[PDB]
Design an enzyme around this catalytic site. Sequence first.
Site, PDB file in Angstrom:
ATOM      1  N   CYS A 135       0.805  -1.245   0.000  1.00 60.55           N
ATOM      2  CA  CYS A 135       0.000   0.000   0.000  1.00 60.55           C
ATOM      3  C   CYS A 135       0.824   1.274   0.000  1.00 60.55           C
ATOM      4  CB  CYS A 135      -0.957   0.034   1.219  1.00 60.55           C
ATOM      5  SG  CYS A 135      -2.007   1.504   1.194  1.00 60.55           S
ATOM      6  N   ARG A 193      -0.090   4.664   2.739  1.00 59.70           N
ATOM      7  CA  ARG A 193      -0.023   4.455   4.188  1.00 59.70           C
ATOM      8  C   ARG A 193       0.326   5.667   5.039  1.00 59.70           C
ATOM      9  NH1 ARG A 193       3.773  -0.554   4.779  1.00 59.70           N
ATOM     10  NH2 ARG A 193       4.342  -0.044   2.602  1.00 59.70           N
ATOM     11  N   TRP A 239      -9.251   6.261  -1.018  1.00 61.00           N
ATOM     12  CA  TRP A 239      -9.528   6.968  -2.274  1.00 61.00           C
ATOM     13  C   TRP A 239      -8.523   6.510  -3.326  1.00 61.00           C
ATOM     14  CZ3 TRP A 239      -8.575   9.863   2.259  1.00 61.00           C
ATOM     15  CH2 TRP A 239      -7.260  10.354   2.424  1.00 61.00           C
ATOM     16  N   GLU A 274      -4.598   3.721 -11.037  1.00 60.10           N
ATOM     17  CA  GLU A 274      -5.403   2.509 -10.891  1.00 60.10           C
ATOM     18  C   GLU A 274      -6.488   2.473 -11.974  1.00 60.10           C
ATOM     19  OE1 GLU A 274      -6.533   1.402  -6.842  1.00 60.10           O
ATOM     20  OE2 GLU A 274      -5.697   3.339  -6.156  1.00 60.10           O
TER      21      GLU A 274
HETATM   22  C1  HEM Z   1      -6.493   6.433   1.732  1.00 66.16           C
HETATM   23  C2  HEM Z   1      -6.082   6.370   0.463  1.00 66.16           C
HETATM   24  C3  HEM Z   1      -5.353   5.136  -0.088  1.00 66.16           C
HETATM   25  C4  HEM Z   1      -4.639   5.133  -1.216  1.00 66.16           C
HETATM   26  C5  HEM Z   1      -4.359   6.327  -2.159  1.00 66.16           C
HETATM   27  C6  HEM Z   1      -4.121   3.785  -1.399  1.00 66.16           C
HETATM   28  C7  HEM Z   1      -3.359   3.342  -2.433  1.00 66.16           C
HETATM   29  C8  HEM Z   1      -3.207   2.000  -2.723  1.00 66.16           C
HETATM   30  C9  HEM Z   1      -2.852   1.437  -4.026  1.00 66.16           C
HETATM   31  C10 HEM Z   1      -2.573   2.235  -5.325  1.00 66.16           C
HETATM   32  C11 HEM Z   1      -2.761   0.109  -3.869  1.00 66.16           C
HETATM   33  C12 HEM Z   1      -2.438  -0.940  -4.965  1.00 66.16           C
HETATM   34  C13 HEM Z   1      -3.836  -1.236  -5.529  1.00 66.16           C
HETATM   35  C14 HEM Z   1      -3.799  -2.277  -6.608  1.00 66.16           C
HETATM   36  O1  HEM Z   1      -2.895  -2.243  -7.477  1.00 66.16           O
HETATM   37  O2  HEM Z   1      -4.710  -3.131  -6.615  1.00 66.16           O
HETATM   38  C15 HEM Z   1      -3.085  -0.229  -2.489  1.00 66.16           C
HETATM   39  C16 HEM Z   1      -3.087  -1.524  -1.977  1.00 66.16           C
HETATM   40  C17 HEM Z   1      -3.520  -1.915  -0.723  1.00 66.16           C
HETATM   41  N1  HEM Z   1      -3.913  -1.066   0.304  1.00 66.16           N
HETATM   42 FE1  HEM Z   1      -4.093   1.007   0.034  1.00 66.16          FE
HETATM   43  N2  HEM Z   1      -4.515   3.013  -0.326  1.00 66.16           N
HETATM   44  C18 HEM Z   1      -5.337   3.792   0.482  1.00 66.16           C
HETATM   45  C19 HEM Z   1      -6.021   3.362   1.621  1.00 66.16           C
HETATM   46  C20 HEM Z   1      -6.026   2.083   2.159  1.00 66.16           C
HETATM   47  C21 HEM Z   1      -6.808   1.640   3.298  1.00 66.16           C
HETATM   48  C22 HEM Z   1      -7.871   2.475   4.049  1.00 66.16           C
HETATM   49  C23 HEM Z   1      -6.460   0.374   3.570  1.00 66.16           C
HETATM   50  C24 HEM Z   1      -7.007  -0.553   4.678  1.00 66.16           C
HETATM   51  C25 HEM Z   1      -7.467  -0.052   5.838  1.00 66.16           C
HETATM   52  C26 HEM Z   1      -5.479  -0.042   2.616  1.00 66.16           C
HETATM   53  C27 HEM Z   1      -4.832  -1.266   2.573  1.00 66.16           C
HETATM   54  C28 HEM Z   1      -4.311  -1.789   1.406  1.00 66.16           C
HETATM   55  C29 HEM Z   1      -4.046  -3.197   1.175  1.00 66.16           C
HETATM   56  C30 HEM Z   1      -4.290  -4.368   2.164  1.00 66.16           C
HETATM   57  C31 HEM Z   1      -3.518  -3.276  -0.229  1.00 66.16           C
HETATM   58  C32 HEM Z   1      -3.097  -4.580  -0.979  1.00 66.16           C
HETATM   59  C33 HEM Z   1      -4.356  -5.001  -1.752  1.00 66.16           C
HETATM   60  C34 HEM Z   1      -4.248  -6.382  -2.370  1.00 66.16           C
HETATM   61  O3  HEM Z   1      -3.349  -7.177  -1.983  1.00 66.16           O
HETATM   62  O4  HEM Z   1      -5.080  -6.670  -3.277  1.00 66.16           O
HETATM   63  N3  HEM Z   1      -5.180   1.031   1.800  1.00 66.16           N
HETATM   64  N4  HEM Z   1      -3.295   0.961  -1.785  1.00 66.16           N
HETATM   65  C1  LIG Z   2      -4.312 -12.416  -7.002  1.00 67.48           C
HETATM   66  C2  LIG Z   2      -4.514 -11.172  -6.168  1.00 67.48           C
HETATM   67  C3  LIG Z   2      -3.845 -11.038  -4.949  1.00 67.48           C
HETATM   68  C4  LIG Z   2      -4.027  -9.885  -4.181  1.00 67.48           C
HETATM   69  N1  LIG Z   2      -3.385  -9.764  -2.990  1.00 67.48           N
HETATM   70  N2  LIG Z   2      -4.854  -8.913  -4.638  1.00 67.48           N
HETATM   71  C5  LIG Z   2      -5.516  -9.005  -5.822  1.00 67.48           C
HETATM   72  C6  LIG Z   2      -6.416  -7.858  -6.271  1.00 67.48           C
HETATM   73  C7  LIG Z   2      -5.805  -7.162  -7.498  1.00 67.48           C
HETATM   74  C8  LIG Z   2      -4.520  -6.346  -7.239  1.00 67.48           C
HETATM   75  N3  LIG Z   2      -4.506  -5.357  -8.325  1.00 67.48           N
HETATM   76  C9  LIG Z   2      -5.735  -5.380  -9.093  1.00 67.48           C
HETATM   77  C10 LIG Z   2      -6.700  -6.136  -8.174  1.00 67.48           C
HETATM   78  O1  LIG Z   2      -7.145  -5.242  -7.154  1.00 67.48           O
HETATM   79  C11 LIG Z   2      -7.986  -4.185  -7.610  1.00 67.48           C
HETATM   80  C12 LIG Z   2      -8.444  -3.392  -6.385  1.00 67.48           C
HETATM   81  N4  LIG Z   2      -7.396  -2.622  -5.742  1.00 67.48           N
HETATM   82  C13 LIG Z   2      -7.661  -1.305  -5.169  1.00 67.48           C
HETATM   83  C14 LIG Z   2      -9.148  -0.970  -5.124  1.00 67.48           C
HETATM   84  C15 LIG Z   2      -7.052  -1.175  -3.769  1.00 67.48           C
HETATM   85  C16 LIG Z   2      -7.224   0.224  -3.181  1.00 67.48           C
HETATM   86  C17 LIG Z   2      -6.785   1.392  -3.816  1.00 67.48           C
HETATM   87  C18 LIG Z   2      -6.950   2.651  -3.224  1.00 67.48           C
HETATM   88  C19 LIG Z   2      -7.579   2.744  -1.979  1.00 67.48           C
HETATM   89  C20 LIG Z   2      -8.012   1.581  -1.354  1.00 67.48           C
HETATM   90  F1  LIG Z   2      -8.612   1.585  -0.147  1.00 67.48           F
HETATM   91  C21 LIG Z   2      -7.842   0.341  -1.951  1.00 67.48           C
HETATM   92  C22 LIG Z   2      -5.363 -10.145  -6.611  1.00 67.48           C
END
Ligand code: HEM
Ligand SMILES: Cc1cc(N)nc(C[C@@H]2CNC[C@@H]2OCCN[C@@H](C)Cc2cccc(F)c2)c1
Lengths: 409, 411
Positions: free
Chosen positions: B108, B111, B280, B285
């Site tokens: 993330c 953070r 947000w 993305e």
């Molecule tokens: C507040 C504004 C935030 C921004 C701009 C942001 C930005 C991002 C972005 C760009 C990613 C990669 C998304 C992707 O490629 O799918 C990400 C991943 C992630 N974020 Fe954030 N984030 C925010 C808030 C949060 C919040 C509120 C949480 C949880 C309380 C969070 C927890 C995570 C987690 C667990 C991932 C990994 C998702 C996955 O493995 O699919 N983030 N964040």
């Molecule tokens: C196989 C797999 C593993 C994993 N850990 N996550 C995924 C999800 C995959 C990882 N990139 C594409 C798909 O997520 C799309 C959603 N991601 C955003 C909405 C997260 C986000 C952004 C900004 C703020 C916020 F709170 C959350 C797939």
Amino acid sequence: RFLKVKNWETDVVLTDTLHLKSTLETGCTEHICMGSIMLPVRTKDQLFPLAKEFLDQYYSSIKRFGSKAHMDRLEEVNKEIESTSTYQLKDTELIYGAKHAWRNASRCVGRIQWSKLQVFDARDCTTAHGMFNYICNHVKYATNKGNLRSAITIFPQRTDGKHDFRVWNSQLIRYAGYKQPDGSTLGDPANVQFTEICIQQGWKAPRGRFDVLPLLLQANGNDPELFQIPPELVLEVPIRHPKFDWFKDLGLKWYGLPAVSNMLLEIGGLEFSACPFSGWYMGTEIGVRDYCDNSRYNILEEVAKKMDLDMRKTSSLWKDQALVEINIAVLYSFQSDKVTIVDHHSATESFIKHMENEYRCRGGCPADWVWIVPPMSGSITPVFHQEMLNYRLTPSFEYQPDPWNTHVW
Amino acid sequence: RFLKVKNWETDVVLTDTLHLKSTLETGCTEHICMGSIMLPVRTKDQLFPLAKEFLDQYYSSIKRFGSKAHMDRLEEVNKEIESTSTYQLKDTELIYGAKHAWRNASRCVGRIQWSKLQVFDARDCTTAHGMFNYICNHVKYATNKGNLRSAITIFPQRTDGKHDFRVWNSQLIRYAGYKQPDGSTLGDPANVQFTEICIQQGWKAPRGRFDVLPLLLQANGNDPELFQIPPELVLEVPIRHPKFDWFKDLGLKWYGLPAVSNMLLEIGGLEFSACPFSGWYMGTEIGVRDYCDNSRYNILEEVAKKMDLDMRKTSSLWKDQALVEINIAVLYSFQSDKVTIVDHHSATESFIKHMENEYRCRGGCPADWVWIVPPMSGSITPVFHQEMLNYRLTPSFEYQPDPWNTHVWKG
Ligand code: HEM
Ligand SMILES: Cc1cc(N)nc(C[C@@H]2CNC[C@@H]2OCCN[C@@H](C)Cc2cccc(F)c2)c1
Ligand code: HEM
Ligand SMILES: Cc1cc(N)nc(C[C@@H]2CNC[C@@H]2OCCN[C@@H](C)Cc2cccc(F)c2)c1
Ligand SMILES: C[C@H](O)[C@H](O)[C@H]1CNc2nc(N)[nH]c(=O)c2N1
Ligand SMILES: C[C@H](O)[C@H](O)[C@H]1CNc2nc(N)[nH]c(=O)c2N1
Ligand SMILES: [Zn+2]
């Protein structure tokens, strides 16, 4: 222990078995991943297992594994190590070794080419003047009037470690950097320390922005000597843009031949500390990294201004717009001057095809995603979506530290 | 031990000691790095150590380590575990836990915001209808008419693994995808399988390009139930370009609220299998991944056609040129409608400042470079040049498999 890699765009899954032949350590542990860290003699006892491992792979490759000639060569090499504390590679083994060091280079996107490599055996070289001659010939061969050809030149192997051959330069061709009274840097900021060492050793610096550095060559563990590469052997390209007439006014140029000269080639336990190699550029190296890194030529702000973009806010994406134009200019300029170059779309597409070939024919392909994904437009190239396993196979190219630390004058 | 990371642009070196608190495994070994691999009930026995480690961390954070209140709580939880096989978190512990799972989320980039998180405690929820109401309230609160606020809603924890709460949607708000008989896709190809499930469960699909999916909600291990989010709660932004007036007629829009609903929150050994959270968007993305991935909306060609780019050779960089204009459009559209968004330059610069602060005050910041570096213009962001250490800290968010693969259908 048998590992899967998935492409998330195509759903293609490949099984890696080649990693079980890996030997060296990654720097990662079960608790910590060091994937983004840039940097994560041999006794008679150590050397024979390395030689055997290499010779087995070699005889296997020419389908004479277990043959009398296989067994006879291990015997010959064992006898040679016991008696001389080292051994000499046959020309066939040297060529095989060099090609496989490139095949094994996990950070190289251009490995589809790995079997087409011209190997120049410079193991008979004894002096720095000899080194200069070999290097000029390499430069001329590889450049080939713009129709670039991959090549490596291999100088004598390490012995006791006090008689190393080294090219002190990081690449055969690079531009000087100089610290200014003004406080700014003139030329390439990456080369300030090396330029200083050149001046200290006698180089008369032109004190310009694109001065090709001289070679500093070390033979047989002697103090390095300065040589200028004949200017007519260094092919350079003036940078212009197909649409922006003002672009040429920036006064940018780059050299055509990317030639890495600071790595160590390890083949069958033997260490070649001077092994300059060259291919051809992927355009982003020059347009994204050389021109736009903040610590390099750092030209984004100037181009953006000439483009009349809104530089007041980051969200107008002025940096991104100017980056693309700079990269269009680099590719256009090389293509117009008939100097080989590959764009990142085309290079990464070929690498995916190479990966599939290697999985098919070899059981895998070590690849370092952090380096393979281009420094711009990452996710619109196919490598972004491709899982990669990174591991270390020999023969290998290894980074070695700048010799001006090592060297005692 | 001490591990060092270098920034190759600034030569700033930082020292990580926090990695010594890492327990879980990365997937990597001494012989293989799996840094680009996407996916690399507890006993009483395993539970109390996890509980104790968490409570020790929590009580340290409040400067009450070793206090009577700390010792009493350890005792209380120990007794609860031996006698009921699990335990309940105090509200304060839950809040602390949820904030730290975000703080620890190495993928993330957002953070810097971690300590500003609204936690909605939904542990009193018992039915899918109850889940629906909680989720509506989360959407309304987080959306805040475009002035987005980070939030998480936490449903009851796992018990025997037979009574799990789950949101079947991967995100609270996503568009349907429909595979056509000719092999083309209408809408979002990422959501074809889930859309087919919704339809099978009785959803009447409008069959358009941007149909907001219904929620599919599982309470207490029961079969999931369909609910439509009130359309008036779903904020959307039509996408237009500041200079290209034809951009609007591509017909593009996107939703404002990114809300991950398929992850598992682990706090003190307890598993919250339904914990939707939202922040947000970073513009890339939507503009890079959602619009320009080949396996998503895939608009690059259509855009570059309209820009009259030279599409005969990849070396004209037409894809790169079109990519940048699409991303300008997304940022402009969100900003013009006053919906919170952050560009990748701003987000990555704030992330570096966050990471440096974390190294100073916490002794480290686990970060996954592969995910942190934006999917366009990588090396003109500071994160590209920053060495990072990836390791796993708890509390944490984890991937869990889609529920339709594992669910025991009751009928
Ligand atoms: C507040 C504004 C935030 C921004 C701009 C942001 C930005 C991002 C972005 C760009 C990613 C990669 C998304 C992707 O490629 O799918 C990400 C991943 C992630 N974020 Fe954030 N984030 C925010 C808030 C949060 C919040 C509120 C949480 C949880 C309380 C969070 C927890 C995570 C987690 C667990 C991932 C990994 C998702 C996955 O493995 O699919 N983030 N964040
Ligand atoms: C196989 C797999 C593993 C994993 N850990 N996550 C995924 C999800 C995959 C990882 N990139 C594409 C798909 O997520 C799309 C959603 N991601 C955003 C909405 C997260 C986000 C952004 C900004 C703020 C916020 F709170 C959350 C797939
Ligand atoms: C034929 C054209 C070639 C292309 C297009 C190409 C492409 C590239 C690129 C883009 C990089 C990353 C460079 C960087 O970011 O610094 C790289 C790295 C590398 N390549 Fe190649 N390559 C080519 C030929 C070769 C050859 C001929 C060899 C050796 C015989 C080689 C071995 C290596 C090694 C060892 C690295 C890592 C360098 C380092 O650690 O600094 N490549 N390649
Ligand atoms: C600390 C450190 C470690 C390491 N392994 N390499 C470097 C060198 C760093 C790593 N990227 C920037 C700098 O090299 C630029 C030169 N690389 C190009 C010319 C390689 C190349 C490209 C195409 C063909 C070819 F033969 C060679 C630095
Ligand atoms: C810190 C990070 O590992 C470093 O900046 C890397 C990232 N990826 C790279 N990729 C390539 N091809 N070349 C590089 O020099 C780098 N630098
Ligand atoms: C194979 C590779 O790990 C995969 O495509 C990753 C790369 N980096 C990413 N980075 C982010 N933020 N999100 C992603 O989905 C991915 N995908
Ligand atoms: Zn690793």
